């Protein structure tokens, strides 16, 4: 083990042993013969070249099947020294099969993290590996990329290291398709800082940050086809630190919750976890309090899709949720208010309406309305009277409006989504309140966990908002990696050839957010009351079919749901259904009922609606979503980003199984190869001359003598020139020193070492001093 001892039982899952390493460096390999050839099914296969005649190479696959291919097709394998490499930017041959096979080989050894130059790649193991313990947290603490294997704990430390050195806010941007591992890794970044904090409401700040996610997930996460624990809202967690790097505070900002789910489920999905956790009957008292049965099929709002998930123990999860609230210091009144309002939502959908004999709705019984009103601190009669006959102002008096059954049914649904969404926002504000300390803040490390890219058989407004964010984040990566990076080289006068990596999604983003775009057309249509779903569809088509390359006709299939257009997103073409986007965007509420909510006897409910106002105000869902997303993006622009790219291996949640075309599609649309190329071809690290002189004068003070003013650039030139480094690895800019990949790391190894030698030679002289004092005493007597 040696260097790998600090990790313990985790070491074989992070870095292979020297004994395993040398066994690989003796394996059979012929530079000329051993290659990679494409495959129509499995993307690329390893092969040994038998012969070639007429620019058509013949070879045998790893499955033992002979085949002949052209020129471009044949790609060089990397020698056995590169087997399961920790940073792929260090491979001799960098192409698609080299990246894919290095990931496949590592994944096969349960090594899920791999560096890709300045960023990191992770493949979902669909298995819990002994690599996230406190012993590992301590092992990664302070380590440089060289002395530590790839891991989310490593990304976390490196982000903390740049925070203290540069005295600058950092961000961890975890990307991926729904099911990839974003939430998993977000919670590990939080674990890292919380465990480190525990070393040198009810629980401590560290226990509270850890418990924040089990609480929000009960309400904001649900089982969808691609993920049993899908995030139905996006979040940004800022972990605040003091000047000395001590954990100070933390805060959570959440984004657009999938309100639709509360009252609606597609064939293969569930409502929010909380409903089923409560129904588990682990805490029977909750069912008695909520006046509910233990059967989800008795609750129409939640029983449309599935009600149980194999991977999910709702009884164990309810305990997790209830305890999270205890740790975050929620009162019994606060906890029960959330439970009673969840039950009230469950009863709301069981409220049935019928037509008055000879076009107005009236209640079809009151039992569920009585139960709902009891829990919500309302008078059931006022609520039913308020749903059927809402009051509308006639200047200096009040006139009641009529409502048919469909209108009342729509209203009770809308009010249920409103109570739920508002109760979620209450819980985030409440958590933030516990997480806010009196302690001083200098900087933060913000973690971004968005709702991942999804494609269902039915895609609506919900999916456009979700996928739009993924597009916007992918373009944040593109802009940072390929645009700013190269503009920096030119800006600093570094000799550079601009490279078009073909990573630009502005076209698509513009089709969505820019004026006359999908969202703009929707927001404009919300203004007209005569407007319908078809008038909106008509406007979209007029303005974009055959005009915006990314907007296409829907690619409808027999039996599969109707779609109105198809949008070519970065991660794939999605067929959208525009039915009900106008109601979705305006989100109108029966204000007479919202008034009874304000006058509620349940302290919690009145608080949720006290502030209430909203229109088509004149602020829409899409308008507010675009606004919050741009606020996020510009705030992220003022942070040092660190990207974690989560790859989903297969569509069957199978551990250790890679689907070659699926892994490949992800590596392509993420631009993993392009991102490795810019690290290799460019200068990934750079430092201002003043900061360089400061930090590395220690390496050789004689190059920068203390007497005179030495021009900061001539100081950097003479200092680096004096060192035992490759003098081709650095270039001089107008304000900064540019370093080719790996030079900064070596400069840091040299610095760490030299610093320890100085300490010891200082201590050696201290020892000489203390001893010569005692010798003077000997000379006295």
């Amino acid at each position: 083990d040696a260097e790998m001892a600090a990790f313990g039982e985790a070491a074989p899952y992070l870095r292979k042993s020297e004994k395993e390493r040398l066994e690989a460096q003796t394996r059979p390999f012929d530079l000329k013969k051993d290659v990679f050839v494409p495959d129509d099914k499995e993307e690329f296969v390893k092969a040994t070249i038998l012969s070639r005649e007429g620019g058509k190479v013949t070879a045998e696959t790893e499955h033992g099947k002979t085949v002949t291919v052209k020129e471009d097709q044949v790609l060089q394998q990397n020698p056995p020294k590169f087997d399961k490499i920790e940073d792929m930017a260090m491979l001799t041959f960098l192409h698609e099969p080299a990246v894919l096979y290095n990931l496949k080989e590592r994944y096969a050894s349960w090594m899920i993290y791999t560096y890709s130059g300045l960023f990191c790649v992770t493949i979902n193991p669909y298995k819990w590996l002994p690599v996230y313990n406190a012993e590992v947290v301590a092992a990664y603490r302070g380590k440089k990329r060289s002395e530590a294997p790839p891991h989310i704990f490593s990304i976390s430390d490196n982000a903390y290291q740049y925070m203290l050195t540069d005295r600058e806010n950092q961000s961890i941007l975890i990307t991926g398709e729904s099911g990839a591992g974003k939430t998993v890794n977000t919670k590990r970044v939080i674990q890292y800082f919380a465990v480190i904090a525990a070393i040198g409401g009810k629980g401590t700040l560290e226990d509270q940050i850890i418990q924040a996610n089990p609480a929000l997930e009960a309400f904001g996460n649900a089982k969808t086809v691609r993920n049993d624990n899908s995030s139905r809202f996006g979040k940004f967690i800022r972990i605040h630190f003091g000047a000395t790097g001590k954990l100070a505070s933390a805060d959570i900002e959440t984004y657009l919750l999938e309100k639709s789910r509360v009252i609606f489920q597609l064939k293969a999905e569930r409502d929010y976890h909380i409903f089923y956790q409560i129904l588990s009957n682990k805490k029977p008292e909750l069912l008695d309090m909520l006046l509910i049965t233990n059967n989800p099929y008795d609750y129409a709002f939640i029983s449309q899709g599935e009600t149980t998930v194999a991977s999910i123990d709702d009884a164990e999860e309810l305990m997790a949720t209830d305890n999270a609230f205890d740790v975050l210091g929620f009162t019994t009144e606060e906890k029960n208010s959330m439970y009673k309002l969840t039950g009230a939502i469950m009863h709301f959908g069981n409220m049935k309406f019928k037509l008055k004999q000879r076009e107005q709705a009236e209640p079809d019984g009151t039992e569920e309305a009585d139960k709902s009103a009891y829990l919500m601190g309302l008078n059931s009669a006022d609520l039913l009277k308020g749903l059927c006959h809402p009051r509308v102002k006639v200047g200096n008096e009040y006139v009641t409006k009529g409502q048919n059954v469909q209108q009342v049914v729509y209203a009770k649904g809308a009010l249920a989504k409103a109570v739920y969404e508002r109760m979620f926002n209450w819980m985030v504000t409440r958590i933030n309140a516990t997480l806010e300390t009196k302690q001083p803040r200098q900087y933060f490390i913000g973690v971004l966990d968005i709702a991942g890219f999804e494609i269902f058989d039915f895609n609506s407004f919900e999916q456009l908002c979700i996928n739009f964010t993924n597009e916007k984040l992918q373009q944040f990566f593109n802009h940072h990696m390929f645009v700013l990076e190269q503009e920096e080289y030119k800006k600093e006068g570094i000799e550079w050839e601009f490279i078009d990596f073909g990573m630009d999604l502005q076209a698509c983003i513009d089709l969505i957010e820019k004026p006359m775009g999908i969202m703009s057309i929707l927001e404009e249509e919300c203004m007209f009351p005569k407007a319908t779903d078809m008038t909106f569809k008509a406007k979209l088509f007029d303005n974009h079919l055959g005009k915006s390359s990314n907007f296409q006709k829907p690619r409808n299939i027999k039996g599969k749901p109707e779609a109105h257009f198809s949008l070519i997103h970065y991660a794939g073409t999605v067929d959208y259904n525009i039915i009900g986007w106008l109601q979705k965007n305006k989100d109108p509420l029966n204000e007479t009922v919202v008034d009874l909510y304000k006058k509620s006897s349940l302290k919690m409910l009145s608080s949720l609606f006290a502030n209430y106002a909203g229109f088509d105000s004149f602020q829409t869902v899409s308008a507010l979503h675009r606004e919050n997303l741009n606020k996020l993006m510009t705030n992220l622009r003022s942070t040092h980003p660190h990207f974690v790219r989560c790859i989903i291996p297969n569509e069957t949640k199978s551990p250790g199984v890679i689907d070659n075309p699926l892994v490949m599609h992800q590596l392509r649309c993420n631009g993993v190869l392009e991102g490795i190329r810019i690290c290799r071809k460019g200068f990934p690290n750079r430092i201002l001359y003043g900061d360089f002189r400061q930090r590395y004068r220690i390496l050789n003070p004689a190059a920068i003598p203390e007497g005179q003013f030495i021009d900061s650039r001539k100081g950097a030139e003479k200092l680096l020139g004096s060192l035992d480094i490759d003098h081709n690895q650095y270039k001089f800019g107008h304000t900064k020193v540019f370093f080719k990949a790996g030079l900064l790391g070596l400069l840091e190894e040299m610095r760490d070492e030299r610093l320890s030698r100085i300490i010891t030679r200082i201590q050696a002289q201290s020892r000489g001093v203390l001893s010569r004092m005692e010798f003077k005493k000997l000379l006295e007597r």
């Binding site: 220690i698 300490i759 010891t760 030679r761 200082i762 201590q763 001093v769 001893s771």
Partner: protein, 157 residues
């Protein structure tokens, strides 16, 4: 590696032999120092070797060998001759740079408590007693150290 040429004058050897008697803790004055005493003798004679460099001349001794093993002047002299043959002990500018790593603000002053902790935890750990005795009245009104002054101080004597 006890096969070293002695390039010390007959004068030098007598002056060292004179300091050597002072460390002679033997009852019968058999002119022998322990292996543990060796480091303190090298230091008394002008050298400032590292714990490691001393153990190198002592042929990597055992714990109760440092306390029990005896050495005459003739076995000590080559050790001093070898130790003196290292002059890469660190320049003033190197030491200042080493301590300047802890000057978080670059004002030329490091917090007294910080320098103490550094000397007691990093490199070859110094004892709380060694750092107390060494940091004796070195701190200003604010309880911090001018590391350029501390370096000049330890370098002289």
């Amino acid at each position: 590696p006890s096969k070293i040429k002695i390039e010390f004058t007959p004068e030098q050897i007598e002056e060292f032999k004179e300091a050597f008697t002072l460390f002679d803790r033997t009852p019968k004055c058999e002119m022998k120092i322990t292996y543990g005493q060796c480091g303190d003798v090298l230091r008394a004679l002008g050298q400032n070797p590292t714990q490691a460099e001393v153990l190198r001349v002592l042929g990597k001794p055992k714990q109760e060998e440092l306390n029990s093993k005896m050495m005459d002047f003739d076995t000590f002299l080559p050790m001093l001759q070898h130790i003196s043959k290292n002059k890469d002990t660190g320049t003033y500018e190197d030491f200042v740079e080493g301590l300047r790593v802890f000057d978080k603000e670059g004002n030329g002053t490091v917090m007294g408590a910080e320098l103490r902790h550094v000397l007691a935890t990093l490199g070859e750990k110094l004892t709380e007693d060694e750092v107390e005795k060494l940091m004796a009245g070195q701190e200003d009104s604010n309880g911090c150290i001018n590391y350029e002054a501390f370096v000049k101080h330890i370098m002289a004597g």
